[PDB]
């Protein structure tokens, strides 16, 4: 079965045959589209087909499909499965898997870079302290004094689901959030709950507007532990505006390294519940969402106030005007400090080229339009006008529940 | 099977039961979501009666008369008419219910909070293109209302056997002409280029400017379509000025007041109305963002940027974005200053969230296409961006249909 997608600004048509290799489910049916819904142990019965599928894909890529080396590997794996009810990935396989999970991530506009990923094997790690050390090295490596490098650190896979490795932080670096007695929030409202956990776990909170949270790390299913990331490792950028001198006096800054740590990496049926990964920012993540979401730092009013905009009638588009200035400032700041960042015009543009390339050499590129189109200036980016097919491939990054909701506490 | 949608900016959760009564497909499956796809002959008589019955059942339910013998009476009456004439005719009341509910069910429409206040013009007695022109002039005049716009729809005779099709060949009653001129550049609207010269190809004489209102091309009873010019005094246009920059007038931009879509097909109880132009009023971004700034359209960003003397170095200065905002500020300013109806995208999305809360509470749900409801600029600072929505097809409905010229037997 063939499937065609059209770009309505260019009239470019592509043909998708990759969706035919789609395993997982979308959530959609013939009678309902769930395209804007935010959210989508294991036995031997189901494990070896998943393993075989992965190994078929792997040996295809390395042009050795049907080789003796391919057959032995399959033989090696199901025997290890029958014997031990799981199996171990070779280094080359783990690297292939991590890269393709990224490549398969339909919601990620940054996928043009998927082949260049630094994979850190942390499967030999046994304690929270060992986790902290690995994560420190990830951060230093990825940050690279502002010249950011994509990386992922992979901790041991789930076994019986009772000994999971987890990073309890949603991101390796993120600011604390403190609900005040009067209802107001100091810092990042997105992190109020997690902040409170840290505090209960023993974290002495500085209680400022931009406090970098401590790492909260769980190894082998034990209770998690607190660690402060060495400050000399946390790169930050003070936010200024190229023309607006008062903007610096807003007291804003952000950290340079986006490093997502709460997702689950699935490769050939194995589940890696701790797999922090990092790239670099698209400007709008900070300038639009982190700074201007009502449920976040929410600075539109204050910024628009000091711009002296007509703020009483929303038809003045004072919100829209302030939003552009803030995103200009975020970009200006990262560039002036020689910290890697990409504007949403450049990013969406490169993604169109990537997606085109992927249809040609791979037969498709799964893509979630709802997530790929930038949160401002949508129709003046080329992805807005691009039809996309959304489907799920493995290897993949999955969501998982928050560890505090599922953890059995030891004491 | 009893689904929940969450607003992530407010934590409000609505439970959807209405989706259960959906019948038509989405294009999606368990394996593939086609949510971002733009576009995913007459019916037999045993195809038609279940369609009739479903419609009649909900009509009589709506008027608190479900299971009444008056309900039963109408059912048998229609069944006999179908059995006999292989079709049937809508009562005036049913026709009005059908139209309002086709709008209520348009999951891509952000302005649906107004769905019940729709003026329905029954044009089912029309027999000629000249008659169509007349009905359409009255529609336009009524809808425009000297700037104080009023929602309206005009319904021409239903399809019969596909030979008697009434169609309006225009996509909107009012649109600007577009010509391919010698430089290889485009004067006027590039989106209408093909239509703009099917017009002269049948007799039009173009004033070859950049904002020439197109002639109506009307097709009655399957006959060859005919050209009629809308009386200029019926076409309300707004000169585009900016409230702070007054080099802006020199751009010489204008647009029309009345968005009136004329190429869709209205389905009611199995019956197909192939000519059913309807109109409401503009959301600001349709003009400022799409009509003016699309690369496939008037594409005026660079020009505007230049006059703002912005850093057009590379993309990172966000000059496109800065200009986009000013352009949309001017559209809203112009329309408002002429007291011509227009809604900004903040106001209209907030209206729609409230409409959702009304529809979930009184109807059990509200079908909604997130990809279309989110405005084409400033997406995440509108409430709808953070609103989960379920998309499904309810009938009565507005559907798409082939462009007439690709079908019409000459
Ligand atoms: C290198 C530069 C990169 C850029 C500019 C980029 C850009 C983005 C953006 C803007 C999002 C949407 C996030 C949001 O709105 O919250 C996203 C999502 C995502 N990205 Fe990338 N990304 C990059 C690298 C990576 C890497 C290295 C990985 C994994 C190894 C990755 C995997 C993902 C995944 C799995 C999502 C889905 C997020 C979710 O579902 O919550 N990306 N990306
Ligand atoms: C009165 C104020 C109204 C507003 C502010 C409004 C707003 C909108 C907007 C912004 C769109 C997106 C279309 C696009 O971007 O091309 C849309 C689509 C649509 N509207 Fe509404 N509308 C209004 C009235 C109406 C009326 C009166 C009807 C029918 C009687 C209607 C039926 C539809 C339908 C069927 C679509 C889908 C368009 C398509 O599928 O191509 N609207 N509306
Ligand atoms: N509430 C909430 C909530 C908030 C956000 C999300 C998705 C967040 N995705 C963040 C993300 C993931 C990967 C990235 C990769 C690179 C990059 N620059 N940013 C990313 C950002 C999901 C939920 Cl349920
Ligand atoms: N090509 C193409 C193409 C381009 C645009 C569209 C959408 C056209 N419908 C626009 C529309 C429909 C109804 C409206 C009602 C009110 C309003 N203010 N705007 C509308 C705008 C559809 C297609 Cl197939
Ligand atoms: C309800 C809706 O799915 C949700 O708000 C989505 C919309 N699209 C998004 N797109 C990106 N990149 N990031 C997001 O958090 C969201 N949020
Ligand atoms: C391919 C994609 O579906 C296309 O660009 C859509 C996106 N969303 C839209 N939303 C609205 N309101 N109007 C449109 O024309 C479109 N076009
Ligand atoms: Zn879908």
Coordinates of N, CA and C and ligand atoms in Angstrom, one line a residue, chain A residues 26 28-29 32-35, chain B residues 26 28-29 32-35, ligand 7:
Chain A
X26 N -1.6 4.1 17.1 CA -1.6 5.6 17.1 C -2.5 6.2 18.2
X28 N -5.6 6.5 17.2 CA -6.7 6.9 16.3 C -7.4 5.6 15.9
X29 N -8.7 5.9 15.4 CA -9.5 4.8 14.8 C -10.0 5.4 13.5
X32 N -12.4 8.2 14.9 CA -11.8 9.3 15.8 C -10.4 9.5 15.6
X33 N -10.0 10.8 15.6 CA -8.6 11.2 15.5 C -8.2 11.8 16.9
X34 N -7.2 11.1 17.4 CA -6.6 11.6 18.7 C -5.3 12.3 18.6
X35 N -5.1 13.0 17.4 CA -3.9 13.6 17.1 C -3.4 14.7 18.0
Chain B
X26 N -12.5 9.0 9.5 CA -11.5 10.1 9.7 C -10.4 10.1 8.6
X28 N -8.0 8.1 9.5 CA -7.0 7.5 10.4 C -7.3 6.1 10.6
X29 N -6.2 5.4 11.1 CA -6.4 4.0 11.5 C -5.5 3.8 12.8
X32 N -1.9 4.5 11.5 CA -1.5 5.8 10.9 C -2.5 6.9 11.2
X33 N -2.0 8.1 11.7 CA -2.8 9.2 11.9 C -2.6 10.1 10.7
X34 N -3.7 10.5 10.1 CA -3.7 11.4 8.9 C -4.2 12.8 9.3
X35 N -4.1 13.1 10.6 CA -4.6 14.4 11.1 C -4.1 15.7 10.4
Ligands
LIG7 ZN1 -5.5 10.7 13.7

